[PDB]
Design a protein around this ligand. Sequence first.
Ligand code: OGA
Ligand code: MG
Ligand code: NI
Ligand code: ZN
Length: 331
Amino acid sequence: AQNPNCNIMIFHPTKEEFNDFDKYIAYMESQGAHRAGLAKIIPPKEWKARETYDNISEILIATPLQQVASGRAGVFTQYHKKKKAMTVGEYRHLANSKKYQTPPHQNFEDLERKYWKNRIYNSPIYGADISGSLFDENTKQWNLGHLGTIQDLLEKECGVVIEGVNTPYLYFGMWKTTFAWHTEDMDLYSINYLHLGEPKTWYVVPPEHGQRLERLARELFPGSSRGCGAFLRHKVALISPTVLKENGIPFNRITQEAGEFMVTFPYGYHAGFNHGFNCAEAINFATPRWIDYGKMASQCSCGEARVTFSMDAFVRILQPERYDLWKRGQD
Ligand SMILES: O=C(O)CNC(=O)C(=O)O
Ligand SMILES: [Mg+2]
Ligand code: NI
Ligand SMILES: [Zn+2]
């Protein structure tokens, strides 16, 4: 069995190997990459996402989200308070202000310490989930707006033809902006490219151990667990590495830098934080190996998780027994 310790693997494809996206994902899996839940892919030196970022400040963040924490430093939830619209140029200036900027630090490890010590005492503003792309249309390799769609994968593997679309999303971050512990919708893959700016630190639980994280989360967030049998779908709960280690939960960590891709694999729980002003692009995708994870994915039916249009068909076809309850939670 390849990668039996479930370590995060780092790949350096050549320009030739960067041509065929599906083939390279399958290659990484042949080497056991999926066992970690997360892999890093460093593009060949010849590749670029676009020529420059000199022209992005006019993008609008229609609904910036202030991430307000409750709990203790290592075990907390966050709620998203909506803020007035602002441009990327306005948000960059805000990120760089004395109130929000990254503090002085020695290295990534020192910054990670400071994040976990102090996160809860601040409320950073995240421009998340913005439909759009920063890949140049002429970038042919690993262009996250030109991937094969999940609907087409389901049609190819299963024969069924469904509605829905699959487009990328932009994320503008600042110091301490946080992504809570989650798997993807329908336990899909994700791919994330850090276009520019400061790093993103990731934590991940191997898919084979995801239920260990779920059981800890039920212990640590007991009212949320009574409310919903899949409350991590709400994407609000944070648990620190120290708390994970105290409770014996297997996990790994890695820091993504600008110019790097990360892939999350089906049912790989992940969480993390931004080091300073940055911009990432991410999208969900599927492969044949996903289908069995999609069939078994948990679902939130309590009403909180509310998701895209395109998830309807996935539930309807892969999980027809659950469909009626889940759709009630959507409506
Ligand atoms: O970058 C972020 O805030 C969150 N991204 C993801 O969870 C992802 O790419 O799957
Ligand atoms: Mg612009
Ligand atoms: Ni994710
Ligand atoms: Zn729920």
